[PDB]
Design a protein around this ligand. Structure first.
Ligand SMILES: [Zn+2]
Ligand SMILES: [Zn+2]
Ligand SMILES: [Zn+2]
Ligand SMILES: [Zn+2]
Lengths: 61, 60
């Protein structure tokens, strides 16, 4: 979808390649750097508020 | 970009099946097709590492 083409919703200057994972679903709205920062702050996923279990660097092929 | 092209495998759904290995993920297939790769015990088609899990990815 077209939202993947937008800069990170947080820093607005890196691509959306940070998948925030919880169970078997993930929200991809931030870059890897900001997603990790959120986990480090102990924040919940900014979309659905689930505990962030895993942060993954995503490559689109 | 590859991001606005559909699943490479079925070409009928978005690339929302994240293939997870380690701290990295390959997005090229939908959730349904990506699950099939794991079930049939295929490695990641892109980097050929084992698939740890499939994550339904929303981009919302
Ligand atoms: Zn960012
Ligand atoms: Zn979420
Ligand atoms: Zn597919
Ligand atoms: Zn891979």
């Amino acid at each position: 979808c077209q939202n993947l083409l937008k800069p990170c919703s947080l820093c607005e200057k890196r691509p959306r390649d940070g998948n925030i994972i919880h169970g078997r679903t993930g929200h991809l709205v931030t870059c890897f750097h900001c997603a990790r920062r959120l986990k480090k702050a102990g924040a919940s996923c900014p979309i659905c508020k689930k505990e962030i279990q895993l942060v993954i660097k995503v490559f689109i092929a | 970009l590859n991001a606005i092209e559909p699943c490479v495998i079925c070409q009928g759904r978005p690339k929302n099946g994240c293939i997870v290995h380690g701290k990295t993920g390959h997005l090229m297939a939908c959730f349904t097709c990506a699950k099939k790769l794991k079930k049939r015990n295929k490695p990641c088609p892109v980097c050929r590492q084992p698939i740890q899990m499939i994550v339904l990815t929303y981009f919302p």
